[PDB]
Design a protein around this ligand. Structure first.
Ligand code: MG
Ligand code: MG
Ligand code: MG
Ligand code: MG
Lengths: 291, 291, 291, 291
């Protein structure tokens, strides 16, 4: 099952695609629906015709329906430095270091992984909506990541594409600026669907692709497979929930492996496109904040 | 006006003390009430007798009413290293450093202050309720701080006492562990009242006192005045709201100046008592989390 | 306990007077409060000062509070011809008769009492508000009646004063017009309080007084005691609930004994005043409807 | 457009059939939907497949959906004696009479029509649900009637079939018993659809058919056309709303022309079937109330 959501005349409607391309309009709240499917694979609703899912993916709007965030995640959390190359996330001198070894280098090996708070729902956007670059950032990069939807016990309810938008220049100036670099209006995008757990045989065998498009131009193109992830998702979940209650429908984003260069900073009117196998392609325009 | 709130048979009731010791039961939501007073000093409600505020402060419960968090803050944010001595927040080698200078040392001077995400409302507790020490922390300290209640424009609606409970050992191991050290069930307490802006002539002239009590014993006693704060509150507010919408009733906690020693780690059954001039004394029992 | 309710800035607040003239502001819905008192005499709320009940009775408004209907009764039902003299309710020829005996004459004796539907809550008014005379009525009379508040089982939760406003001319033309004569905007008023069951030792020993005031002038004055009621209230309740569910807070009005003459028809600007022992005095201005 | 409603796992869902047999699941409340269609013929929702309307009509339930009342009418009102033959509604002596002429005879001619209060929503049932015979009734008859759905101004939003269930024996004993004879649990049924105003060219040219079925047996069969209605619907509406606000979605039932004989009283397990042209057939089992 693949869940999506549209806004229509100020109200939300949720939908699900079943393997055979048939669309079901949902009776329940989409988070409730994900919890139910997790149990017995039951889906409550009616089969609809005239909802053109493929056109929604391409055009964002048809008639008076517009695709958006597939759910409102009460909380969003991130995980850091979960790939081999991620040790080198900012290799240049000026990095913070613990006795000669950099903070990122140290955390890559350490028993305890990095976990940070990413976003509240109102700070998130979806397919076809604008992500944002801070007014005081000179170097902001999108981070293509696989993300899980969780229940309150830390059980995986589904998978989706997330963009961990990061003001990389601010983080570099001082690791104490990390929350400012990560948390703001439009700092995060996800979708276009949430896929149920059975839609992915092996989460550690999916292609993640990032393209940045500037005035028709492919400004960057990069691809890494999830078989290169060295810190497993279950361990990330484990540390996130320890002494820390998370509500149903929380999203954990599992860290990036694709890092554009210092000169590949995002700017106004850019188009970020992120693809993951079996999920789809998340497309977001870019908008620079004014002082 | 000083606002407090009680839970009574599963429902909330808000109250306000006016200068002349008279108690008013509020008609409106306490956040709405704070916004209104901010405008014209109007308070909607009825004068009550038989609500013994002084006894509530001492005993927490009388009959079937219990004092608690005076509001539900939709978000709580913290500010870091805002006092002269705070450069030395963990002076010992092993600290992360940028070209010989430590991260805390650097941020104390830098134009940009430290701002981090502290808590969601359900992660907060109030007067007479238990704060918590993480199951995997060997060194947790309370941070006595002055905190402001804000509206969505960043206007100060009032002041209160906050305890920025911190797993200091985790932060020390790696500054990337800071969110884990700061954000969890019972990581934050505030109250016992919120005082309106006019109740404090000068926020930069108040005594903050911390006492930790172990089995009747004064395990620690420390006091610093707010005239020692080097980073003003308005600048902290400025950086918090930049490209970052905050809902009405958000709390910003302004940083601590009282730092107990490495051996003064909190443990089960401890009692933390925090006093600030004109506000009152916040009292919370301590509870250690089990693995 | 005596319950009243005020509207204040578009919202309701309920209050109760206890024997010793002390005022309690209620925590619960007033219907819920009546149900609870019915059980164990428990009242949930805070004692207030500065609510001048006696002034409310006289002046209707003080500052920004106005007295109104003490509850919203989901349904209001009436009982007919429950007094000895009520056989003569319209004695003049032209009355409908069953084999020489009039319909009212017949129902006075018959095993089955008269029960009719009186009003929905939005068709009711309270102390100090305008009752209404139909645009097409040439002869409308107020009917001073004792009324009970009931729960869903038909248990008496309290007593109050009701005015069964009746377009008597329409009823006289044809008994099939009775619902039009009885049910309309402002066809019904009650209050100013609801008194709990223990506030009345004997419901069959209370003085009911009707006065109609026209431009300072006592246009009518009449008084009958409830010891003259020949059809008991419990029997009226019995027939009302038979195969007929009534929601909590339903009001049954028990029939009138005071019937002004054919020439005493109500008109614009009139003031109806109804007094019952131990309850109080219901005062309503009169307003004639325009075609 | 023809509206129906199902209950499914404790929640309601509304649907509409468009001329071409296509089913639309509604976005809005069905009363809101009727008001909108009344304006510009706009319908908000999605086309569905797998909702078998014809099977619902026949079988009441399929899988986990059950047809019921198409709306919750906040109020239901009735009109009386609107057909030529209705003068003879109980011709036998013992009838109430005004100077030799019976009450029904008088009201048939009189400028003012009969209007009475019929039911609250919780006293109503729909297609496939049980109507009821009072425990103390020895002669109850169904009254097949055309009914209008109205807005607050008295504008016709649609048409439907209603059964004005009447304890005829109680009415006959005394016209003052009419409300007891008319208003009770299960005193009223309507459906199975509401048809929009354009679905009926002439309301005064429709066949109304009543059949009562006892153990497979046609116990009664009767049919009258609406071209025999002598009191027009607009006049009934006019008198209903005069000085009398009615909420959106109120139903007025326009009076019956089919009156079974004194021996045709309903009993337990009976099946009442009512047909009107262009609307459909309302089917309700019968259940006798126990003392
Ligand atoms: Mg990331
Ligand atoms: Mg702190
Ligand atoms: Mg009366
Ligand atoms: Mg009828």
């Amino acid at each position: 099952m693949k869940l999506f959501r549209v806004v229509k005349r100020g109200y939300y409607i949720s939908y699900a695609i079943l393997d055979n391309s048939t669309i079901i309009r949902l009776d329940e709240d989409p988070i409730k629906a994900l919890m139910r499917y997790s149990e017995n694979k039951e889906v409550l609703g009616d089969r609809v015709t005239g909802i053109d899912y493929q056109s929604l993916l391409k055009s964002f709007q048809i008639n008076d329906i517009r695709i958006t965030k597939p759910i409102d995640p009460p909380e969003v959390w991130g995980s850091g430095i979960s790939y081999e190359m991620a040790r080198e996330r900012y290799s240049e001198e000026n990095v913070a270091k613990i006795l000669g070894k950099t903070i990122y280098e140290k955390v890559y090996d350490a028993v305890r992984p990095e976990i940070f708070f990413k976003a509240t729902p109102n700070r998130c956007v979806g397919h076809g909506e604008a992500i944002a670059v801070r007014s005081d950032s000179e170097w902001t990069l999108p981070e293509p990541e696989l993300a899980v939807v969780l229940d309150s016990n830390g059980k995986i309810l589904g998978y989706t594409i997330m963009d961990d938008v990061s003001a990389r220049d601010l983080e570099a100036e001082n690791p104490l600026y990390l929350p400012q670099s990560k948390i703001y209006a439009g700092c995060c995008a996800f979708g276009p669907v949430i896929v149920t757990s059975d839609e992915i045989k092996n989460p550690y065998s999916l292609d993640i692709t990032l393209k940045i498009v500037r005035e028709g131009r492919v400004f960057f193109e990069g691809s890494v497979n999830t078989n290169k992830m060295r810190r497993k998702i279950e361990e990330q979940i484990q540390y996130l929930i320890r002494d820390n209650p998370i509500p149903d429908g929380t999203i954990l984003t599992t860290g990036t492996a694709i890092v554009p260069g210092r000169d590949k900073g995002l700017k106004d009117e850019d188009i970020v496109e992120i693809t993951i196998s079996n999920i789809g392609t998340l497309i977001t325009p870019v908008k620079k904040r004014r002082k």
